[PDB]
Structure 1
Amino acid sequence: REIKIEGDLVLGGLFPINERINEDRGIQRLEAMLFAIDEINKDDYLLPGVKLGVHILDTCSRDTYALEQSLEFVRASLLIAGVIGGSYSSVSIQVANLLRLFQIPQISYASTSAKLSDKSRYDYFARTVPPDFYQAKAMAEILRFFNWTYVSTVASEGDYGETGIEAFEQEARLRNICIATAEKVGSYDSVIRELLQKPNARVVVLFMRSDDSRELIAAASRANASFTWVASDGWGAQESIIKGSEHVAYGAITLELASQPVRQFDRYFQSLNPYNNHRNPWFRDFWEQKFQCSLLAIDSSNYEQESKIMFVVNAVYAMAHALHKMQRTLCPNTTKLCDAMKILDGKKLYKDYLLKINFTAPFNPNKDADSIVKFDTFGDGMGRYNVFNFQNVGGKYSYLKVGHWAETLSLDVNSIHWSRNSVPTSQCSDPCAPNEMKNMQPGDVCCWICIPCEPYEYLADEFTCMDCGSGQWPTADLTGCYDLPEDYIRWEDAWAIGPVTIACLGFMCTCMVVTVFIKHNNTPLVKASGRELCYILLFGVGLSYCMTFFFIAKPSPVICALRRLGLGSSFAICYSALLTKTNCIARQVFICLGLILVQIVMVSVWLILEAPGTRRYTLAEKRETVILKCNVKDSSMLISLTYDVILVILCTVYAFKTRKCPENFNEAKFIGFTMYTTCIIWLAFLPIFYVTSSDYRVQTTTMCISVSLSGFVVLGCLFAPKV
């Protein structure tokens, strides 16, 4: 039962006027689509001369009942510069596969599918309401705002759920949002039983149908295990979806589309009676089913005005301003039909100056804020959502409007209510302390594992850990780690108590020997020996007492200069002062031959005096040791004294021959047993010197052991009863 009201050029429109007569989503809209043309053809601010006409049908929500109507539009190619509206999604996808085939554009006031932006097929389809592939980029950019980046989704089955959710994951992996489970309701209440077995995912992304999101929540009062319900448009502000589960569905957020409703439309529509409406074929039919009467009037107590009445009067203007540009720019100085308005080619209509129009909606303020009825490059207006909340003040439910957003989130941050006031992160990995600073993603993203790394190591990265180098221990963190000192044995340490007492024998070395050096040269056996030779033959014993304190005092390069040079003067006193005096005694002007022989091995040390390391080093044992106090090898100083014992190897040669023939009082016993006793400790401390850790007593105490036995057992016996 169409109505075709004539005009200079006529618009066409489809509406549900069938199920019964629908009044919520139905005939309320067709009353509004008539109401705009009563203003546009009257208000001469827009199109002055060309009077608009209307010719509208009854879409009855059945697809192949809409298409049997839709050819009666195009039997005039009552020429029609476009058709307004396909309400549902499934009725608009059928008059968008017949209205590309006549090059005539379409504007649908409310149909919000997501296959209706694939403009490779539809070159003639521009809706005003936003596509629902934006709520997969709405909530996916508030979770990264709240850092709840580990979620658990649930869809519906059919066309709504499988489109948004498959667009939700691919619009989440950019924003580092990391799903856990994925259900699909077609089970009854066991869907929560498959949901509790991931219990660090406590943010439920709910992208659901209307009534198939009632059977979940009403059966989520059985298990009584609440959550944080973030929900897409399936909730809306419906107060029946939260029917009695206020103790269960507490603390939720939801989205809906904003529409500041037209005030004077209530001045239009409530002023409409079925005795003064002859310009409609359905006001008389609706009046029966409005009140179930067999025949009152419309009050404000039964005219709760629909939330998309603004979207028809917004989207019927976006042709009437893309035609007032036509009647001026394509035909100046011609208000009426200029004979170029005869064949109105739609291809240069839609793609040229309807695609990117810009103007303001009627009956609303803030003309630069939100009423800019823009388009994108696809035929889909910008998203203007609300973010409602179930933040109950305590009345019972109290749906709360905590703000809006268009392109970036603009919340009013005092609504996050979860248990009492909780912002649950719902995060899996829980990044740990720097004590476990190997926070490495094992195989997958977003859920890493912490690991305490090596105690000689610092964290090389957020996942990596590396040692800070040989020597130094780590820091208190992964910063610059430390340094590494050496063994400072300058104090006692039960190591400076021994040779400090052994130095007294070296201090008493030059004491008793100086008595026969000058004042007692007139002894009967002072002239019988090398009275000038003994002062050189006994001066080196104090050197052995001093080279221990020259070397083993503290690590220094001058000390290592004294350490390598300290031992090189021990053995010529031990051998050349000994052996040259015995050979002339074995058979006295030839006693001068022992002078230059001391410089034989000693001058060769002067060539190696500058070759090896002198300053310092640091030797590394198992992960904590730095002591190599001078940069020399252990076998380097041992080979430096290889000729030392080799020089006193012939020191026992003259002991065997003169073992029984003393040329003096006790020179065969005190001196003959001396070289046997001197080679004993000389051979004793040699293999032990390779193996030590403190190394002091094997160096210091063994050196003075030769020094004490030298002057006492040999030189002391000649003067002990002399007194």
Structure 2
Amino acid sequence: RSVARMDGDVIIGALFSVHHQPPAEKVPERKCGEIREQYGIQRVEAMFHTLDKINADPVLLPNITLGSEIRDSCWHSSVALEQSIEFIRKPIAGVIGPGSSSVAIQVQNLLQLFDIPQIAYSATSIDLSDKTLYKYFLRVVPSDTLQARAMLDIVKRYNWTYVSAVHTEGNYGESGMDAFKELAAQEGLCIAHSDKIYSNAGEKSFDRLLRKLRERLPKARVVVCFCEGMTVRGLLSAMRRLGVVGEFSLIGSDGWADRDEVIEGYEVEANGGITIKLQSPEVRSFDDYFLKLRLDTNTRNPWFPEFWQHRFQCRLPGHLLENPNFKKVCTGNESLEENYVQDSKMGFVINAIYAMAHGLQNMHHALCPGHVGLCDAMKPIDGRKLLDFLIKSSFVGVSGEEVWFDEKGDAPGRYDIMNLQYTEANRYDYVHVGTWHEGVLNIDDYKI
């Protein structure tokens, strides 16, 4: 499997969903789906970019260059584990990712055996806060103990007393929904229908899911989905097949948030949806770098050629990765600015990388006092010690966010409440209608 590398004194591993997960039938041979931009290429480039800057920075890690070994997780436990084995087969100092809680648990179960700290940028499961089971895990995002509370507050806000519940099979949906149901039970909120499903389940399964939900109408119109985006898309698609529109009031978790790829093509069935988004400021710095990448000068990113052809539905003559679905040759001058959309969690990806650097810096200050570069004490780097320095690190993120971790490796965070609506213009957009921070729900009622 391809691997994006950058040499340096200390090597940082990373796991990103460069491709979609393998089709249910291909799982055994671990053959992945199509190339991804927001969750794949953009994150791979964000790592390269962040490391470039850090290595060009005189204050952070003065004479210590950070290298990398970026691997594809295909958002799947089996591929992620396969690739994590490669990390431990210069030794990896720490790992960034993967994005899924279930997948993250699989990776952490192996990494902890070699004392390799892991920092997530999107794994929000409450379970990962258990340090007896996940000692070497930390993250720059808040656990879903909060998101579940935010979701219940929204339901309470609009006096909904009877709701249906759906979650994506796996640790993220299961842990999040269990927390929500626990809160609901305390508050006396009734759950009409409850169901679960795998994001990659067949259409017949999503058909069944939808049918079961409709049967609980019209009393159970509100549907709480602690779901991955693809699970939500699977449901919209099922609504498309049955010819139904606007029957439910969907309230989704961060797997949906304000992601365009989730509702693309199904804006009609998705319209009116209310979602939760992890607050993360747009990273302009990244756009300036990313949009200037060219298919001829970007050689450090092994997947770029595959990406370009897919991004511009064109093919590369003679290229081994020539796409057999497009005829118009790639002019190699197409603009990455067309319909461009930055990964919604870009800030977290970047700050997770910076957290790793700050951990290494803090460790160097303590173990190699007065030394210029790495000293005997950090040759090799002791993962167990690096973990403690990471947990005790605090800094200002790429966009001003205060980043630090509590004893459980959890970071502070908050959410933006989004509402999908048909704007004045002939277009559907994610309107920012509110926020949830420290138990306080603020929603602009006139905006909804």
- After TM superposition, is the score higher than 0.5? yes
CA–CA separation in structure 2 for the residues paired with 1:16 and 1:390: 26
Name which of 341, 349, 353 aligns with 2:386. Answer: 349
CA distance 1:216–1:256, shift in 2 (3 Å): farther
Aligned to 1:210: 232
Q: Which amino acid in 1 is paired with 2:61?
A: L
CA–CA separation in structure 2 for the residues paired with 1:283 and 1:190: 41
SS at match of 1:213: helix
Aligned to 1:270: 291
Equivalent positions of 1:91-240 (< 5 A) are 91-144=103-156, 146=157, 148=159, 150-156=161-167, 158-159=169-170, 161-174=173-186, 176-184=187-195, 186=205, 187=208, 190-196=211-217, 199=219, 203-208=222-227, 209-214=231-236, 218=240, 222=244, 226=247, 228-233=249-254, 235-237=256-258, 238=260, 239-240=263-264
> Post-superposition shift, 1:34?
0.7
SS at match of 2:46: helix
For 1:226-278, what per-residue CA distance to the aligned partner results, in whole angstroms no more than 9, with x for missing partners? 565444345533444863358xx54x532122332221222212222233234
Aligned to 1:30: 44
Equivalent positions of 1:488-527 (< 5 A) are none
Equivalent positions of 1:547-626 (< 5 A) are none
SS at match of 1:116: helix
Query: CA contact under 8 A between 2:237 and 2:266: conserved in structure 1?
Result: no
Structure with greater Cα Rg? 1
Q: Percent identity?
A: 41
Equivalent positions of 1:234-633 (< 5 A) are 235-237=256-258, 238=260, 239-240=263-264, 243-245=267-269, 250=272, 252-291=273-312, 292-295=314-317, 296-299=332-335, 300-301=337-338, 303-350=340-387, 352-362=388-398, 364=399, 367=400, 371-390=401-420, 395=425, 397-415=428-446
SS at match of 1:136: helix
CA–CA separation in structure 2 for the residues paired with 1:190 and 1:59: 33
SS at match of 2:162: strand
Higher helix share: 2
CA distance 1:311–1:157, shift in 2 (3 Å): closer
> Could you say which structure has the greater relative contact order, defined with CA pairs below 8 angstroms and 6 or more residues apart?
2
Q: Does 1:13 align with 2:34?
A: no
Q: Which amino acid in 2 is paired with 1:341?
A: M
SS at match of 1:261: coil
CA–CA separation in structure 2 for the residues paired with 1:169 and 1:94: 25
CA distance 1:196–1:312, shift in 2 (3 Å): closer
Aligned to 2:28: none
Of 316-325 and 334-343, the range deviating more from structure 2? 334-343
CA–CA separation in structure 2 for the residues paired with 1:40 and 1:157: 37
CA distance 1:218–1:383, shift in 2 (3 Å): farther
CA–CA separation in structure 1 for the residues paired with 2:52 and 2:442: 39
SS at match of 2:372: coil
SS at match of 1:244: helix
TM-score calculated relative to the size of structure 2: 0.78
CA–CA separation in structure 2 for the residues paired with 1:205 and 1:60: 27
> Post-superposition shift, 1:36?
0.7
SS at match of 1:94: helix
> Post-superposition shift, 1:31?
1.0
For 1:193-220, what per-residue CA distance to the aligned partner results, in whole angstroms no more than 9, with x for missing partners? 53237x4x66543444312431565589
CA distance 1:380–1:219, shift in 2 (3 Å): farther
> Post-superposition shift, 1:106?
0.9
Higher strand share: 2
Q: Which amino acid in 2 is paired with 1:13?
A: A
Structure 2 unaligned regions, length at least 5: 20-32, 197-204, 318-331
> Post-superposition shift, 1:341?
1.3
Q: Which amino acid in 2 is paired with 1:349?
A: L
CA–CA separation in structure 2 for the residues paired with 1:58 and 1:253: 31
Query: CA contact under 8 A between 2:164 and 2:221: conserved in structure 1?
Result: no
CA distance 1:204–1:306, shift in 2 (3 Å): closer
CA–CA separation in structure 1 for the residues paired with 2:353 and 2:445: 39
